[PDB]
Amino acid sequence: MGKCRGLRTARKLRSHRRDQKWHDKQYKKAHLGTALKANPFGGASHAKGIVLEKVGVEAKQPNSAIRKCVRVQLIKNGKKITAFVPNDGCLNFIEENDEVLVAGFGRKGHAVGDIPGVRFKVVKVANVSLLALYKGKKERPR
Amino acid sequence: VRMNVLADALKSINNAEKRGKRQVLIRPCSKVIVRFLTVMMKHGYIGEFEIIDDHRAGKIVVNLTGRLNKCGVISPRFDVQLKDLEKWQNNLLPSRQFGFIVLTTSAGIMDHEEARRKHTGGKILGFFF
Amino acid sequence: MRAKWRKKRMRRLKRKRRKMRQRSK
Amino acid sequence: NKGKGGKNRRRGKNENESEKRELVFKEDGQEYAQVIKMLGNGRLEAMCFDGVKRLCHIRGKLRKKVWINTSDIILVGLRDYQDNKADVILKYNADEARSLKAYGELPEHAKI
Amino acid sequence: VHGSLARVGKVRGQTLKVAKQEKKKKRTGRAKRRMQYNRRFVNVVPTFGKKKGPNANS
Amino acid sequence: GKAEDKEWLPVTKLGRLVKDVKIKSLEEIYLFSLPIKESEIIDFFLGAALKDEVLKIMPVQKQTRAAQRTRFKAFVAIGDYNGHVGLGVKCSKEVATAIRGAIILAKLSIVPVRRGYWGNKIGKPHTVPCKVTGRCGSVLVHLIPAPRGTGIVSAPVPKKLLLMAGIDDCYTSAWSCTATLGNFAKATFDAISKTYSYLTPDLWKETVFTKSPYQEFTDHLVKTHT
RNA sequence: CGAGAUGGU
RNA sequence: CGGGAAACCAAAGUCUUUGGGUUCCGGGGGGAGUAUGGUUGCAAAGCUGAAACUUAAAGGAAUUGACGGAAGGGCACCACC
RNA sequence: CCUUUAACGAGGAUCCAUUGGAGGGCAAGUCUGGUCGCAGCAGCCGCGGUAAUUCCAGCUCCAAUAGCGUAUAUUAAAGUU
């Protein structure tokens, strides 16, 4: 409640605001740089990696399903990721030991919906898009 | 402690107006208070007033007519220039049609409409409507 | 009194961790 | 008909595990198994009779209905990927399990 | 159930397939906004106050 | 059936006078600040010029030994687009009775609205006369004068009441839980209502008194009436 | 002032 | 009086009609008063004090039910004498 | 290349407009066939266990239009610094 108002108080006002900004959760992680070292993409919107393994993860209650996912190793860091595969039957296009392009799931590093602990999704397989494969416009070259 | 006398004078009038009382007593008196009251009286917001000598700064009794909606103080006496006065009357007044800011200037204590005719800036004291 | 007991549980774990690390070097 | 638990909760529809319980055998992608251990969280350890042990999971349809137990006999669906993991499809009663072995459908390993 | 659980692509593979029944071309640009104006404002039939939307089926 | 007369007969002194003698407007009912308790008085003065709007229908319920028991609550606004607006609420076991009951209370609540100018005084007035505010629950609502031809700068709920009141131009602001439509509507109607009871320099001249309608027509209520 | 834990439909 | 989400408060009032002076200090729930460095102490310990990761609510005041190995009236051989 | 100008150049079944949607927030179907807590959808609240307004498809309708969708940094909304 008691804020100082005197005509020479500008050093107290300016430096107290500067000190109190560090209690905002969004301000702190943008300015310390610990989150930028921790993030498995080094500040990019997308990354390339190689498919290790295909897996099915159990959805959180109150609903019931097996959500189709992949485990991936990124090219530029060699660190490990798991990513969701959108649409009905798309797991049949992916194969193993080949390149995917991966993207964020839409919530800036947090998980989405009933899938436990998955932060990423697949968008391109062997330089062809999953949408162009799913709508029959293109096919995997072999 | 008492850091400012003009803020007491206006808070005391403002509480008496809201209770519907016909008179109020202001203490201590000052040269700044007598000049501020005179600007409200000349525009028709208060009645006439009388000063008591007591050999210790003095006292004032004021007569109230029921027209006053508010009077108030801006505590740091900020400087104003003619180009910036529009922003202050946009912040503090209830309409463009009525109410007044009070300034202190080297030509005297005055109404913010008179400061434009006299082509002068100053420091802010308070307002009424 | 669960919070007072969670405070006691942490103090005895910290006393163990203290003696374990300060023995090493 | 006869209850075999005891409670207020008559609020469901009765189980009727009766009459035309027509005997079910494998298709492609399925195996018969015996339960070895039960874990927490709706999952279990099971051995199928050609000798590959797996970690196994109760399908959402069988929750709080078809109570599985140790040494019980079940029908299991295999995955085309992640071969260590599988899901339960059916339980066989001791009356059905002996009919599977009478049709020669099970190796002489399963207990009844 | 037929085959195993956790089989991908099941319902898109089961679904019976039907060819497109359309023939005629739609309008474009100015001519489509002209058509929408005449259908929504110019000649109109009134109803009871529980007024009815553009795609009412029953 | 056919809409002949005698659907109404008065039950108050004011109703006996309005049906008979030269009470010529609502403004001479407002001047003496009288309560209105017969809905047919406002159909006599404003009538078919009044237009009607359902703001929300809301379910509410109480717990019992057997089950949850549900009622429907309707919020209704009414006005003539030229200086009169009202708001009303009722809760009933069925929606059709709740709406029909809410319209009667929205007619009994009508108030006169003041209008003014932002600039120089050309033509007829078109905005609020000065900066005003109203409260309900935690919700606070505030209205500000605007130059000619801006329209209303507001969310949907306050915009509909200001349009029905007959205000063309307005800037607005709000604070705390506006997601409760009932407190947001009442905070807006409280701000609109205060416009005719703010003391301003054009209202400073001395008041001249007259006799009230019960005093001028004091013999009409006696000689042939009950 | 005896002893009186627990909860698939 | 007036204020408030209300319980309540002559202050917890004189606030969108928002500025008497001035000190300390909060920013969704957890991880956590934890790890690590410094410092004080004979010891127990005190002071200062993170992040990775995780999550759709956690919480305040009040209303109507149901429930109590809570209290007070009254009743029944599908209760007891 | 643009501008200027002779000769050929249009009946629509072509000289054929697309990208996202139709439970709510938020414009637009309590149509018809398939699946059956599976396959899948879903920013958020939520849909699917044999009569699905939400999945997969046909028809109809909505929005912006030579453009429309998604990931990530940042300003407003935030009187949530």
Coordinates of N, CA and C in Angstrom, one line a residue, chain B residues 24-77:
Chain B
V24 N -17.8 25.1 7.8 CA -16.6 24.3 8.2 C -15.5 25.3 8.7
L25 N -14.7 24.7 9.6 CA -13.5 25.4 10.2 C -12.2 24.8 9.7
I26 N -11.3 25.7 9.2 CA -10.0 25.3 8.6 C -8.9 25.9 9.5
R27 N -7.9 25.1 9.9 CA -6.8 25.4 10.8 C -5.6 24.4 10.5
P28 N -4.4 24.9 10.4 CA -3.9 26.3 10.3 C -4.3 27.0 8.9
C29 N -4.5 28.3 9.0 CA -4.5 29.2 7.8 C -3.1 29.4 7.1
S30 N -3.1 29.8 5.9 CA -1.9 30.1 5.1 C -2.3 31.1 3.9
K31 N -1.3 31.9 3.4 CA -1.4 32.7 2.2 C -1.9 31.9 1.0
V32 N -1.4 30.6 0.9 CA -1.8 29.7 -0.3 C -3.3 29.3 -0.2
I33 N -3.8 29.0 1.0 CA -5.2 28.6 1.2 C -6.1 29.8 0.9
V34 N -5.9 31.0 1.4 CA -6.7 32.2 1.1 C -6.8 32.5 -0.4
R35 N -5.7 32.3 -1.2 CA -5.7 32.5 -2.6 C -6.4 31.4 -3.4
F36 N -6.3 30.2 -2.9 CA -7.1 29.0 -3.5 C -8.6 29.2 -3.3
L37 N -9.0 29.5 -2.1 CA -10.5 29.7 -1.7 C -11.1 30.8 -2.6
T38 N -10.3 31.9 -2.8 CA -10.8 33.0 -3.6 C -11.1 32.6 -5.1
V39 N -10.3 31.7 -5.7 CA -10.6 31.2 -7.0 C -11.9 30.4 -7.1
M40 N -12.2 29.5 -6.1 CA -13.5 28.8 -6.0 C -14.7 29.8 -5.8
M41 N -14.5 30.8 -5.0 CA -15.5 31.8 -4.7 C -15.9 32.6 -5.9
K42 N -14.9 33.1 -6.6 CA -15.1 33.9 -7.9 C -15.8 33.2 -9.0
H43 N -15.7 31.8 -9.1 CA -16.4 31.0 -10.0 C -17.8 30.5 -9.5
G44 N -18.1 30.7 -8.2 CA -19.5 30.4 -7.7 C -19.7 29.1 -6.9
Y45 N -18.6 28.4 -6.6 CA -18.7 27.1 -5.9 C -18.8 27.1 -4.4
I46 N -18.4 28.2 -3.7 CA -18.5 28.4 -2.3 C -19.0 29.8 -1.9
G47 N -19.6 30.0 -0.7 CA -20.0 31.3 -0.2 C -18.8 32.1 0.3
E48 N -19.1 33.2 1.0 CA -18.1 34.1 1.6 C -17.5 33.5 2.9
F49 N -16.3 34.0 3.3 CA -15.5 33.5 4.4 C -14.8 34.5 5.3
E50 N -14.5 34.2 6.5 CA -14.0 35.0 7.6 C -12.8 34.4 8.3
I51 N -11.8 35.2 8.5 CA -10.5 34.9 9.1 C -10.4 35.3 10.6
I52 N -10.0 34.5 11.5 CA -9.8 34.8 12.9 C -8.3 34.9 13.2
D53 N -7.9 36.0 13.8 CA -6.5 36.3 14.4 C -6.4 35.7 15.8
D54 N -5.3 34.9 16.0 CA -5.1 34.3 17.4 C -3.6 34.4 17.8
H55 N -2.8 35.1 17.0 CA -1.3 35.2 17.2 C -0.5 33.9 16.8
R56 N -1.1 32.8 16.3 CA -0.5 31.6 15.9 C -1.0 31.1 14.6
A57 N -0.6 31.7 13.5 CA -1.0 31.3 12.1 C -2.5 31.6 11.7
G58 N -3.4 31.6 12.6 CA -4.9 31.9 12.4 C -5.7 30.7 11.9
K59 N -7.0 31.0 11.8 CA -8.1 30.1 11.4 C -9.1 30.7 10.4
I60 N -9.8 29.9 9.6 CA -10.8 30.4 8.6 C -12.1 29.6 8.8
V61 N -13.3 30.3 8.8 CA -14.6 29.8 8.7 C -15.2 30.1 7.4
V62 N -15.7 29.0 6.7 CA -16.2 29.1 5.3 C -17.7 28.7 5.2
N63 N -18.5 29.3 4.3 CA -19.9 29.1 4.1 C -20.1 28.2 2.9
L64 N -20.9 27.1 2.9 CA -21.1 26.2 1.9 C -22.5 26.3 1.2
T65 N -22.6 26.2 -0.1 CA -23.9 26.4 -0.8 C -24.4 25.1 -1.5
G66 N -23.7 23.9 -1.4 CA -24.2 22.6 -1.9 C -23.9 22.3 -3.3
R67 N -23.2 23.2 -4.1 CA -22.9 23.0 -5.5 C -21.6 22.2 -5.8
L68 N -20.7 22.1 -4.9 CA -19.4 21.5 -5.1 C -19.5 20.0 -5.1
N69 N -19.0 19.3 -6.2 CA -19.0 17.9 -6.3 C -17.6 17.4 -5.7
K70 N -16.5 18.0 -6.0 CA -15.2 17.6 -5.4 C -14.2 18.8 -5.5
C71 N -13.3 18.8 -4.5 CA -12.0 19.6 -4.6 C -10.8 18.7 -4.1
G72 N -9.6 18.9 -4.7 CA -8.5 18.0 -4.4 C -7.1 18.6 -4.8
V73 N -6.1 17.9 -4.4 CA -4.7 18.3 -4.5 C -3.9 17.3 -5.3
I74 N -2.9 17.7 -6.1 CA -1.8 16.8 -6.7 C -0.5 17.1 -5.9
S75 N 0.0 16.0 -5.2 CA 0.9 16.3 -4.1 C 2.3 16.8 -4.6
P76 N 3.1 16.1 -5.5 CA 4.2 16.7 -6.1 C 3.8 17.8 -6.9
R77 N 4.3 19.0 -6.7 CA 4.0 20.2 -7.5 C 4.7 20.2 -8.9

